[PDB]
Amino acid sequence: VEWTDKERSIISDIFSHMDYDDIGPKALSRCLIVYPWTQRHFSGFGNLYNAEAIIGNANVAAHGIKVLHGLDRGVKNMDNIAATYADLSTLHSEKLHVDPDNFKLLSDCITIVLAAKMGHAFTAETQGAFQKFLAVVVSALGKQYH
Amino acid sequence: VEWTDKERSIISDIFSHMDYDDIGPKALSRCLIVYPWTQRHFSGFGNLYNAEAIIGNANVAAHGIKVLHGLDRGVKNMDNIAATYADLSTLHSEKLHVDPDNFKLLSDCITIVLAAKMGHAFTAETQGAFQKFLAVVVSALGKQYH
Amino acid sequence: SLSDKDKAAVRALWSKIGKSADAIGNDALSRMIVVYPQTKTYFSHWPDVTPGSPHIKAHGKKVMGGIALAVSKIDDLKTGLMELSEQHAYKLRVDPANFKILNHCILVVISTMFPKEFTPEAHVSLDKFLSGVALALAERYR
Amino acid sequence: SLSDKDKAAVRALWSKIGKSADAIGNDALSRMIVVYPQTKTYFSHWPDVTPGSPHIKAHGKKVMGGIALAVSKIDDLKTGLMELSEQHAYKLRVDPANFKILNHCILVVISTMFPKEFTPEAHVSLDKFLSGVALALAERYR
Ligand code: HEM
Ligand code: HEM
Ligand code: HEM
Ligand code: HEM
């Protein structure tokens, strides 16, 4: 992607106003409830019994926060995303066996949770830049052919 | 994609043994029948009334042949695919309004028609290299974010 | 397929947010056209497809009225949405790949407008419902 | 959804190619594992998942027996494949995104083995049928 200055500014603004401790746990818990098959990568997280358990699970929260901080390296260098996530890609694939389709599901949950937080400030243009950035990260993680 | 020498040899072998005049019309006619909404880009092709009409339509044949020859430039320079299809991408998008999802549907029909032709010679390894090459072309044409 | 639990969740959510159907539609269509530019071509016959357009606003009412119809026909979406399927497939020739894009935009809009009501449990059932709506709208395609 | 025309096309095709179900399965599973490496993890408990493996061949018989069951239950795939859905969802925990991958591999194998029978008209109905099988296998997932 050839980023416009406006896209860079939007992405920078979004991440600098995001409360990772709030957004991260919400995004991952939402993904585990809306696409429950993803719970299989979190066996030893404890209480994953129902929505209430998942939403309050501190292990799920810790991991959702890690996911958001994992996006920081992409934000820091938007022109080198595929290379930056190469090791994370190998980890989730070879070691963790996460299905490449799961990155897209989680990224839609991050977008939906951010939309709920931002409310009317999550304009179409904001949504377009944010989803475009997540699409690039998802491609690198899932090792899509391009 | 970082092509292996084996992938390059497979792709070269496939294209050098392909009868474009046979495979091209079959792939496009199959796409127009299996995913009939794609027929909307071929209004002035005449007889698109039913499967028999589509399969025998010489305008559909001419276009299917063009599609296959359109893959030649990718075969010729496998390390510069995204750049090579940039103009074709703009044509199908801005001028033709072809939905980016349609390139994938057509590429699966090309794979299925090639499989029927090659029979047992269309091994798993052959299928993997061919689909990987089509995936890269489809990404460039559909302007996927990466 | 939708279970009784899913149908009850969708009916309860719609009961809460239905009063804002018109606004949700205008917002969902507006985002779709901006974020997925390939969808703009279907609305190009309108004299104004730019942000804030009165045609997009008017159409948004119709789109969410179709969602309201789907909620009323939740027990049999195929029969309930058959005429809309025929219209999108034959009269408008809308590529079926776009139904899931508008669905995602509707979920985004509902999240921005009703953060409290749109819980993960409301979202799972609504998402299954919207996939069902897309499958029913795809009925007359092939 | 499958029309009477689609059901008749699938039953007629299966009538012609069913004698080779075992071979089709071995071939389809073999390609899936090689072309979509992410699927190999689900079969890793087997002592041999390499090309030509006797476990893949044996399993291929079971997979196409499931397709044969789906052809017999074509009028109601959800009820007919409910136990298989529960098994893939709960016991095996197979990610549902993989059903469409195996479906594509089955279409590729049928094309290599029955080029004359697998016409564009047989393909459209079989493809709609396989999407229905995937949706029915997804029943117990969420
Ligand atoms: C936008 C997508 C994602 C990003 C940027 C991301 C980021 C990360 C990061 C930064 C870590 C920590 C790495 C380490 O500990 O060395 C991690 C680990 C892990 N991720 Fe992800 N992840 C993503 C999606 C997923 C998805 C979709 C799943 C599963 C469905 C998943 C499952 C895991 C698991 C199980 C761990 C291992 C850590 C442990 O179990 O303690 N991740 N991920
Ligand atoms: C692997 C994918 C494809 C390749 C490599 C490809 C290649 C081409 C080429 C080489 C041309 C001729 C360009 C010219 O005349 O300057 C063309 C034109 C065109 N293509 Fe494609 N194409 C592909 C997919 C599609 C799809 C999926 C559709 C529609 C669903 C489509 C619709 C058209 C139409 C309508 C024309 C304009 C030519 C005319 O109407 O006479 N193409 N394509
Ligand atoms: C959630 C899915 C959708 C619903 C429930 C829906 C519903 C509707 C309804 C109720 C109408 C009015 C029908 C009439 O004229 O009586 C309509 C028309 C239309 N829809 Fe959709 N629709 C959906 C998705 C789409 C998508 C994805 C596109 C295109 C990208 C689309 C493009 C159109 C167009 C072009 C019209 C006609 C506009 C005009 O009157 O000029 N629809 N839709
Ligand atoms: C066309 C779709 C499919 C059909 C009809 C199907 C059918 C079957 C059948 C009949 C069984 C045997 C069940 C039993 O134990 O009684 C089975 C087991 C299994 N299937 Fe599937 N399946 C499908 C797709 C998949 C996919 C996409 C994967 C994974 C990528 C998968 C992985 C498995 C595994 C891991 C087993 C158990 C193997 C064992 O016995 O150790 N299946 N399937």
Side-chain angles (χ1 to χ4, degrees), chain D residues 70-98:
Chain D
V71 175
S72 78
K73 307 301 175 173
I74 200 172
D75 297 304
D76 181 2
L77 292 167
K78 169 183 168 173
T79 300
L81 303 183
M82 179 77 69
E83 311 152 50
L84 275 182
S85 184
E86 180 69 17
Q87 178 164 10
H88 286 78
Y90 290 82
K91 290 55 180 176
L92 309 160
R93 303 183 303 182
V94 167
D95 191 289
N98 297 112

Side-chain angles (χ1 to χ4, degrees), chain D residues 36-114:
Chain D
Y36 306 90
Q38 71 264 215
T39 65
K40 198 176 179 194
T41 182
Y42 299 104
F43 306 104
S44 57
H45 55 287
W46 291 344
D48 185 357
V49 289
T50 71
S53 154
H55 298 87
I56 287 170
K57 175 172 169 191
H59 200 53
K61 300 188 179 171
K62 295 183 178 179
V63 180
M64 297 310 293
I67 291 299
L69 173 66
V71 175
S72 78
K73 307 301 175 173
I74 200 172
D75 297 304
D76 181 2
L77 292 167
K78 169 183 168 173
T79 300
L81 303 183
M82 179 77 69
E83 311 152 50
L84 275 182
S85 184
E86 180 69 17
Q87 178 164 10
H88 286 78
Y90 290 82
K91 290 55 180 176
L92 309 160
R93 303 183 303 182
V94 167
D95 191 289
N98 297 112
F99 299 129
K100 71 193 177 323
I101 289 168
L102 182 54
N103 283 345
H104 176 67
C105 292
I106 286 169
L107 299 183
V108 166
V109 176
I110 292 172
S111 196
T112 67
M113 295 180 176
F114 298 95

Side-chain angles (χ1 to χ4, degrees), chain D residues 12-25:
Chain D
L13 180 63
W14 194 245
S15 171
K16 297 161 191 178
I17 74 175
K19 57 181 173 177
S20 303
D22 290 356
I24 291 164

Side-chain angles (χ1 to χ4, degrees), chain A residues 1 81-82 128 131-132 135-136 139 144-146, chain B residues 1 81-82 128 131-132 135-136 139 144-146:
Chain A
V1 165
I81 295 171
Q131 292 185 181
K132 185 167 166 210
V136 178
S139 177
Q144 301 175 17
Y145 305 135
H146 57 105
Chain B
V1 165
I81 295 171
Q131 292 185 181
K132 185 167 166 210
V136 178
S139 177
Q144 301 175 17
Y145 305 135
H146 57 105

Side-chain angles (χ1 to χ4, degrees), chain A residues 28 31-32 35 37-43 45 59 63-73 85 88 91-92 95-107 110 134 137-138 141, chain D residues 95:
Chain A
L28 187 57
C31 182
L32 298 188
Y35 303 114
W37 47 93
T38 58
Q39 290 174 27
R40 75 161 169 122
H41 302 285
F42 305 96
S43 303
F45 266 22
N59 287 318
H63 282 74
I65 295 168
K66 278 188 187 181
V67 166
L68 290 195
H69 284 294
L71 298 171
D72 288 349
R73 64 193 80 180
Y85 287 90
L88 267 177
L91 166 72
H92 288 83
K95 192 219 173 181
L96 272 15
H97 307 301
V98 171
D99 193 280
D101 181 69
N102 295 347
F103 300 116
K104 202 254 177 306
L105 303 183
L106 180 53
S107 74
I110 296 174
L134 292 182
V137 172
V138 162
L141 284 174
Chain D
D95 191 289

Side-chain angles (χ1 to χ4, degrees), chain B residues 4 30 40 82 100:
Chain B
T4 63
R30 185 170 288 259
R40 75 161 169 122

Side-chain angles (χ1 to χ4, degrees), chain A residues 104 108 111-112 124 127 131, chain B residues 99, chain C residues 14 21-40 42-43 46 56-68 70 81 84 88 92 94-111 118 123 126-127 129-135 137 141:
Chain A
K104 202 254 177 306
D108 286 340
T111 298
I112 284 162
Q127 174 187 358
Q131 292 185 181
Chain B
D99 193 280
Chain C
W14 194 245
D22 290 356
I24 291 164
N26 174 56
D27 207 321
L29 286 180
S30 295
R31 294 165 179 282
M32 183 176 65
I33 288 160
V34 167
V35 181
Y36 306 90
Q38 71 264 215
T39 65
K40 198 176 179 194
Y42 299 104
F43 306 104
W46 291 344
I56 287 170
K57 175 172 169 191
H59 200 53
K61 300 188 179 171
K62 295 183 178 179
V63 180
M64 297 310 293
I67 291 299
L81 303 183
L84 275 182
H88 286 78
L92 309 160
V94 167
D95 191 289
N98 297 112
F99 299 129
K100 71 193 177 323
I101 289 168
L102 182 54
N103 283 345
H104 176 67
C105 292
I106 286 169
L107 299 183
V108 166
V109 176
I110 292 172
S111 196
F118 197 57
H123 185 171
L126 194 67
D127 190 46
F129 166 78
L130 293 177
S131 298
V133 170
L135 180 60
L137 287 175
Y141 280 81

